Amino acid sequence: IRVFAIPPSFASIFLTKSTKLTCLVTDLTTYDSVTISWTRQNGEAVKTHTNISESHPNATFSAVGEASICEDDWNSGERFTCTVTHTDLPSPLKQTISRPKGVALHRPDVYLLPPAREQLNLRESATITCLVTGFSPADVFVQWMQRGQPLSPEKYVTSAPMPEPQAPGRYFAHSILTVSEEEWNTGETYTCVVAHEALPNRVTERTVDKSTGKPTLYNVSLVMSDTA
Amino acid sequence: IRVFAIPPSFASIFLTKSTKLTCLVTDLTTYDSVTISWTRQNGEAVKTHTNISESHPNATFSAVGEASICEDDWNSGERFTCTVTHTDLPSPLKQTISRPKGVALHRPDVYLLPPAREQLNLRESATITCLVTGFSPADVFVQWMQRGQPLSPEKYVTSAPMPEPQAPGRYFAHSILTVSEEEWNTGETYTCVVAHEALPNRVTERTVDKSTGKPTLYNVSLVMSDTAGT
Amino acid sequence: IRVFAIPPSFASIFLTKSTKLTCLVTDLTTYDSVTISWTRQNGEAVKTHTNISESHPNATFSAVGEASICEDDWNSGERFTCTVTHTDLPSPLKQTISRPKGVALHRPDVYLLPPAREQLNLRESATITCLVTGFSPADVFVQWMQRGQPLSPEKYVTSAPMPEPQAPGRYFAHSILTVSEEEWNTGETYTCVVAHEALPNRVTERTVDKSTGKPTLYNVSLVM
Ligand SMILES: *[C@@H]1O[C@H](CO)[C@@H](O)[C@H](O)[C@H]1NC(C)=O
Ligand SMILES: *[C@@H]1O[C@H](CO)[C@@H](O)[C@H](O)[C@H]1NC(C)=O
Ligand SMILES: *[C@@H]1O[C@H](CO)[C@@H](O)[C@H](O)[C@H]1NC(C)=O
């Protein structure tokens, strides 16, 4: 009986714009009369459940049980407890869901680095990296937009957060968006959206352009002489 | 009896980090045992209703009650009804406020405008404006932060939304942050934050500084008289 | 009751080069004995109000009043009282129309702002705004002129005056001009004029174009 109730990630919270709690049974024979429900503080019980599949190649009952509940309820510590009433165990399988309060809350520092000059000289592609550093919960979401329109998820790839060597509490992550080199030369502005809990507005946007790392000063001095 | 309530705009709920709506009753006699609550169409009212204001000396109430309500439930289209029971009106008075449905949801087109040279040449101050235009509906919230830190609301003021001349459906707004010239000389982010429901992430951030724009300056210092005609 | 006595703002007197007094009749019987006051302190009667409004659908009667009063006489501070002799009230309602005096006059500091780089990069429309700062009181009739010919009122929108955050006495105003990007690229010597009483000539002009907004870039030096 593997009731792995993994809380949805913050990227999943701002991806589908809905908080779906997870209480899924793994490695168990599919049976009937399973009355799953969520019990919280003050005895509230609101639930809608779908995605029930009788047959599985691994002989594991799905019992996905995804319900839409407001984010403020999670922010209030409602301790969402799953109550899977399986036949073998008459007592409901209690699995609580709550945010691990007590962790450090450091806002990320978003830096939109310009593409390398040699790669643009190669005239093949233009990969703009979005270096996100300094976040303790390590729950970061990176999304790219062009002219205010979000791009397809397959154009940009985001690496999983990993601990920072200098700061043990803080974490860092990176993501790259690959476009054509003349697309970069066109003058389009790319915005990197970084979603995190510690941010005052929960998101942060940085804009990159052709004129973000150009040489502000040219100091050419043409000196010509006819003597040794 | 002028019955009216102020619906919680997106700007207010974005500023307060919570969704709360007020029930307001005007031109009624001063009786005790006030029972006002926002009843959802399923028949379940608000949990708590506190912070009721005190009557004006002119025998007119502007009392407002606040409660914690889910934002998804409000903006999904579910209308909220306020029940008003009092000795003056034995029949239960009802109120209704709800955001309009079917209105065009177009993202704002934010273009921050750097200040002109002459305001910098004058030594009094510098004004940085964040031109927000082409957004529907009219409601919008503009916030200014410096280096990721929120600034005081007294420094920046947001203009009231007005329709765009080209398109009647869209609207445009202004927000000016007045800062000293020496602050503009130093490198500061001075981020402009625009909040709107039609945006995907609901927040648009733009940055500006002294090095913003700044076409490349050339310093050609050529020496040619050393040849002296071979 | 209530009467919509709207004093003529500085914009109205600036546009028509004359003062057009307005005292809108509201909340009165449509076809009852009505006597609106249109006399000065001395009692002289102005010319009869023109363009009388028709019968409003509700019980309230509507009427548009106009008058031709001078500039300094209207600035002299005499009282233009609006009172109506009507049978629905035993006593007539008085709402005097007069300029409020004692307000400080501050010279506006207008500074036109070039269009943003992102707007010039996306290239859908070009919005040129004329920022008005440090003007008091809250009155403005800022305009927009194209190559010497003023643009249509519909093209430009003038924002309502609001108190300045740093200076409570002073106010600010906005006036955007939505134009084509190619028009800005070609250069149409757009100009902005702002109307205010505190200026020595009541209006000042600022000129902008594409070459404006571009500093000196080419510091080529010839030395011997
Ligand atoms: C540019 O070059 C000149 C000499 O050619 C030098 O004196 C000057 O310091 C240089 N500019 C900067 C910013 O260093
Ligand atoms: C431009 O060149 C002149 C002549 O060499 C020099 O004196 C000046 O400092 C330069 N300006 C810069 C480098 O900003
Ligand atoms: C331009 O060049 C002259 C050459 O003498 C120099 O004095 C001046 O400082 C330069 N200005 C800039 C902004 O580089």
* Cα–Cα nearest to C131, from C108, C147, C155, C107: C108
- Nearest to C193, CA basis, from C211, C173, C179, C178: C173
Against chain B, the chains showing at least 3 CB pairs within 8 Å are: A, C
CB C121 within 8 A of CB A148: no
Whole-angstrom distance, CA of residue C117 vs CA of residue B212: 9
Residue A106 region, left (φ>0) first, then alpha (ψ -120 to 50), else beta?
beta
Ligand 1 centroid to Cα of residue B222, in Å, is 12
The upper half-sphere exposure of residue C101, i.e. CA atoms within 13 Å in the direction of its Cβ, equals 7
Q: Is C34 exposed, middle or buried (0-12, 13-18, 19+ CB in 10 A)?
A: middle
C119: nearest Cα among B170, B108, A212, B148: B108
Nearest to B84 by CA among B33, B50, B146, B152: B33
| Alpha carbon A110 to its chain's center | 15
Q: Give the integer Cα–Cα distance in Å for A198 and A214.
A: 32
Resolution (A): 3.3
Q: How would CATH label the architecture of A105-228?
A: Sandwich (2.60)
Task: Note whether B1-100 and B105-230 share their fold.
Answer: yes
Tokens representing residue B212 in the block: 């913003």
3-state helix, strand, coil in chain A (%, to 5): 10, 30, 60
| Under 8 Å between Cβ of A105 and A20 | no
The number of residues making up chain A comes to: 228
The type of residue at A179 is V
Q: Interface partners of C (3+ CB pairs, < 8 Å)?
A: A, B
Q: How far, in Å, CA of C198 to CA of C167, rounded?
A: 16
Taking CB atoms and an 8 Å cutoff, what residues of chain B touch A19? none
Ligand 1 contact, B218 CB (< 6 A): no
- C215 CA to middle of ligand 3, Å? 13
Q: How many alpha carbons lie under 13 Å from residue A57 in its C-beta half-sphere?
A: 0
What sign has the CA pseudo-torsion C153, C155, C160, C165? negative
Give distance in angstroms: CA of C215 to centre of ligand 2. Answer: 16
Sort C5 into a burial class: Cβ within 10 Å, 0-12 / 13-18 / 19+.
Answer: buried
Closest CA to B25 of B17, B33, B16, B34: B34
Minimal-distance CA residue to ligand 3 atom 5? C221
CATH of domain B105-230: 2.60.40.10
Q: Provide the 3-class DSSP secondary structure of residue A14.
A: coil
Q: Which two tokens stand for residue C158?
A: 């003038």
DSSP string for residues in A163-185: E-SS-SS-EEEEEEEEE-HHHHH
Q: Where are the domains of chain A?
A: 1-100, 105-228
Length in residues, chain B: 230
Contacts of A187 in chain C (CB under 8 A): 121
Q: Could you tell me which residues come within 8 angstroms of residue B193 by beta carbon, excluding any fewer than 6 positions away? A: A201, B142, B143, B144, B145, B203, B204, B205
Residues in chain A whose Cβ is within 8 Å of chain C: 147, 187-189, 207, 209, 211
* Gap between the Cα atoms of B161 and B170, Å rounded: 10
Burial tier of A91 (Cβ tally within 10 Å: 0-12, 13-18, 19+): exposed
The tokens for A152 are: 């397809």
Provide residues of B within 8 Å CB-CB of chain A.
Answer: 18, 68, 70-73, 107, 109, 143, 145, 148, 150, 193, 199-207, 211, 213-224, 226-230
- 3-class secondary-structure state, position B39: strand
Q: Is the CB of A216 under 6 A from ligand 1?
A: no
Place domain A1-100 in its CATH homologous superfamily: Immunoglobulins (2.60.40.10)
Residue type, position A40, single letter: R
DSSP string of chain C, one letter each residue: ---B--PPPHHHHHHSSSB----BB-SS-TTS---B--B-SS-PBPPPPPS-----SSSS--B-----B-HHHHHTT--EEEEE--TTSSS-EEEEE-PPPS---B----EEEPPPHHHHHH-S-EEEEEEEEEEBSS------EETTEEPPTTTEEEPPPEE-SS-SS-EEE-EEEEE-HHHHHH----EEEEE-SSSTTSEEEEE--SSTT----B--EEE-
Using an 8 Å CB-CB cutoff, list chain A residues near B107. 148
In Å, what is the CA distance from C215 to each residue of B33, B151, B217? 70, 31, 9
Tokens of A116: 């390398």
Cβ atoms of residues B209 and B185 within 8 Å: no
Compare CB distances from B111 to C119, C172, C224 and report the shortest one's residue: C119
Q: Does ligand 2 have an atom closer than 6 angstroms to the CB of B221?
A: yes
B70 and A68 in contact by Cβ < 8 A?
Answer: no
Whether the bond into B137 is cis, omega within 30 of 0: yes
Rounded to the nearest angstrom, the distance between the alpha carbon of C219 and the centre of ligand 3 is 7
**CA distance to A206, B1, B82, B84, B89, per residue, from B37 (Å):** 44, 18, 6, 7, 16
| Minimum-distance ligand 1 atom for the alpha carbon of B221 | 5
C-side interface with B, Cβ within 8 Å?
109, 111-119, 125, 127, 129, 131, 133, 154-157, 159-160, 162, 164-166, 172, 174, 176, 178, 214-224
CB contact under 8 A, B225 and C221: no
Q: Give, for B153, the enclosing helix (H) or strand (E).
A: none
Strand C221-223 and strand B221-223: the pairing is parallel
Whole-Å CA distances, A49 to A20, A36, B55, B71, C93: 10, 9, 48, 22, 67
Ligand 3 near B219 CB (within 6 A): yes
Query: Looking at the domain C105-224, which fold is it?
Result: Immunoglobulin-like (2.60.40)
Closest C-alpha among A14, A11, C86 to residue B199: A14
If one counts every other C-beta atom within 10 angstroms of the C-beta of residue B138, the result is 15
